[PDB]
Amino acid sequence: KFADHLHKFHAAGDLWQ
Amino acid sequence: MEGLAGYVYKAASEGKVLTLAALLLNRSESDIRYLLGYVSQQGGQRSTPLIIAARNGHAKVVRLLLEHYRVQTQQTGTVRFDGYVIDGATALWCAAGAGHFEVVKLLVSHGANVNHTTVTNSTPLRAACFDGRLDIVKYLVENNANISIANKYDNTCLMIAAYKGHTDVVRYLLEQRADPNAKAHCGATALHFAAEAGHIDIVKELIKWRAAIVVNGHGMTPLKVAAESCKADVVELLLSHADCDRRSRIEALELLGASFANDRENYDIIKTYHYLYLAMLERFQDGDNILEKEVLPPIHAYGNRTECRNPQELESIRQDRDALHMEGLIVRERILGADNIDVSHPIIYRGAVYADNMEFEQCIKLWLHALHLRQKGNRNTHKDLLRFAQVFSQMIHLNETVKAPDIECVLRCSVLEIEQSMNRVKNISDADVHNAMDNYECNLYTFLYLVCISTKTQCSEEDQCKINKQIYNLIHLDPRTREGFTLLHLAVNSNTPVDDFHTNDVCSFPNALVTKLLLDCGAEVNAVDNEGNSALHIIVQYNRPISDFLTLHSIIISLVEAGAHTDMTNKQNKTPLDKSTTGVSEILLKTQMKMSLKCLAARAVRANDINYQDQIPRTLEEFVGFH
């Protein structure tokens, strides 16, 4: 499914630990 | 004791005590320090005993290491929690990140660097807040662990506590003189993170502490941030301040009533019309002061829907779930702006749903609009082109014929993105060259897939001229991968990774059509890669010249008729027929090549060296270098 591949876009170091 | 760090590291990995007690045996100062402080490599970490003694939560190992001798608590180290390999992580930092109160109590008691920074300036208190344990946070604060110290991007421990969902440490931090109104490099006030994550209680105690409301760097108020991520619970609280005015009330209501429809997780049509009606009713019943929305031109992507600015017009949409999605896209783009980072994702998700419903006609439109919005924001569109290639391959695979303007637009955006990726690669240092070059190679591969889709699509003469011009621009841009492969070397190489989603269905490198299109577009038929293999040295090394012969004969008869030199020499001094992995691929080459006394004399000059700088024509000075 195409919509399933969109879950991978939900990288930034601002909110990292 | 020279290098016996395996014993101590393995014992501390599971927190063994008796193994370490047997390891230490009556040592004077020199060998006892050489044992206790002996770090090792263990690639990826720093492999100190007192990094894995705290990461795995074993206070006994640290206890024996810190009772009768004081081992280096201030030990620089790198530890990983998923993809979080952060340097400067002492035992206190990694212990707080994992969330063990026992080992932390056995570190600060002797006195540890409670404010030990790193490359990201992540205080141990920030790691504890990321873990979320209340006991470690209050223990650190009570030991003066520098609450005010932020990261590189000004992401103070309160903000990461308000984002990862830990109300207890948030309440404690606000109760211990923290900064509710702390900002960031881009603007990430404490309400922004909690609103984005959607925690009701955290926003409750933040506004109870007067955290105030300030606009983000992307023109986002905390209420708009809350409405953007479809979190309707936090919006209702922030709407109760009665200081946002109706201009922000009807803005946030429309924003979330639009976000609900075109969202992945909490997609609800019932929770879309309700909020849209609550939004418009605020401005369509007041008296002789009614507010009408600002005009929006009819965007072609959203079915030429000019949105709805009437109670009767909106009531006409609570019968068509196909129209509420477009209305949500329109409202989100009207409020969030055409330059926001997160305005693109709902459009791509709606297009993906349309593609999954086999309605590719509107998927192409929506994704083209999303790609235009992303590319006019200087964003990284190295995956949107891949998704276009996948949609086009699925369209070609089933029975469907893709429109030629669609391929034209995607190819133009692809050459623009590849030029931009070349600019980023040329204008960056080795800190992020790896990822930038990986994205550059991905963009090149997506362009190749798009060209392969274009070859397998019949279109009129004007459309083919447009597509050929778009390819010709990138050909003249001269793109090259990390190993020197040009845009033609990959079209003949069988090792280029075709994406497995849907481009694996119909895209088969090497292609005769793709290489003919590239050679007819001015590709350097005689170019070389980093090693020296030309476009002919690579195709000749083909796996299947007995079944894929038609695209091995029509890629050799087309290369050598376009000017490719059949006698060229790479770095290892190997002619193309000397670099033949089969027989059917050297027989074709030997058929498609002619004896020229120029090549024979050039080989004789290159073998018995003549110092061919002068006493030779300028153009033959590279001809001799070819052989």
Residue numbers in the entry:
A (entry chain G): -23 to -14, -7 to -1
B (entry chain D): 1 to 627
Paper's wording?
We recently discovered that FEM1B, a substrate receptor of Cullin 2-RING ligase (CRL2), recognizes C-degrons containing a C-terminal proline. By solving several cryo-EM structures of CRL2FEM1B bound to different C-degrons, we elucidate the dimeric assembly of the complex.
Local refinement was performed on the dimera structure of unCRL2FEM1B-CUX1 to obtain a 3.60 Å resolution structure of the FEM1B-CUX1 subcomplex. The overall architecture of the FEM1B-CUX1 complex exhibits a high degree of structural similarity to that of the FEM1B-CCDC89 complex. In contrast to the CCDC89 Pro-1 residue, the main chain carbonyl group of CUX1 Gln-1 is hydrogen bonded to the side chain of Ser122 in FEM1B. Trp-2 forms two hydrogen bonds with the side chain of FEM1B Arg126 via its main chain carbonyl group, with its side chain making π-π interactions with the aromatic ring of Tyr84; Leu-3 makes hydrophobic interactions with Tyr163 and Phe193; Asp-4 and Gly-5 make very few interactions with FEM1B residues except that the main chain carbonyl group of Asp-4 is hydrogen bonded to Arg126; and Gly-5 makes hydrophobic interactions with Trp-2 to stabilize the CUX1 conformation. The favorable π-π interactions suggest that the pocket likely prefers aromatic residues, such as Phe, Tyr, and Trp, over other residues. F-22A decreased the binding affinity by > 170-fold (KDs: >500 vs. 2.8 µM), suggesting that Phe-22 plays a critical role in binding to FEM1B.
